[PDB]
């Protein structure tokens, strides 16, 4: 989908990269409104289980998301960020897309995400 | 091949990338040792002037990076941060090369580099 990068190797120095598996997931403009499933998260396969960096959808008024804890014993609401713009080329018409990165999410990954965006799928 | 994403729409929420361009300089343990072209840097092409995100280069030890003026009154000595190491994959071998980012260059810039360079090129 979206490939990251970790600083690795001896001296936390050498660039390994990371691909970002993408899942479905609900999010409203409230905790109730997070009701189906309008909506693809970018995530990061790790250790302490999944762990979401930003949001993708067709609606602008979003503030919030809903996921599944590790082995969904639970749930958990993330707020999100104010929405990017943009414009895709879906494989069925081009398709107005916002961007929404959960809050909190630090800025280096802020960027390694979008220019992985940039770079990979087409905007416009 | 490093694209970069910009916000700028009517309430700037809007994204825009931005192919960066390169070009040689040079580089080296200080600032004197400064003298043939040893290394690649990224740069932005603004009005008034140019813009230099990173250093790519096959050479470690560089601390600075020397660029002229543009309108001929001198030349500027930008510091380097340490460098991350990172491995390509051309049909030689495998490449080892080094990633310099400028001192201050931003984190979201740094993420937007290496997001934009770990889908482009071949990591391993
Ligand atoms: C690969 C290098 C790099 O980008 C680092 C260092 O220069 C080196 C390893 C660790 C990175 C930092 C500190 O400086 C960096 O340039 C920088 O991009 C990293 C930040 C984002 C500031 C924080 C993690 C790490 O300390
Ligand atoms: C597209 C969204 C976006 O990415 C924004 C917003 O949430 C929204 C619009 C602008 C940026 C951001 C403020 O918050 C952001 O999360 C952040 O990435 C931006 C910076 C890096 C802090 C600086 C520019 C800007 O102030």
Redesign the pocket.
Known sequence: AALEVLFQGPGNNELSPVALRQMSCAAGTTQTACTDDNALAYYNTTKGGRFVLALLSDLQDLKWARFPKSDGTGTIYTEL????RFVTDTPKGPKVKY?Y?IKGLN?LN?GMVLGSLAATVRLQ
Not at 81 to 84: H, N, R, Y
């Open positions: 960020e104010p929405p990017c961007l990165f800025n802020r």
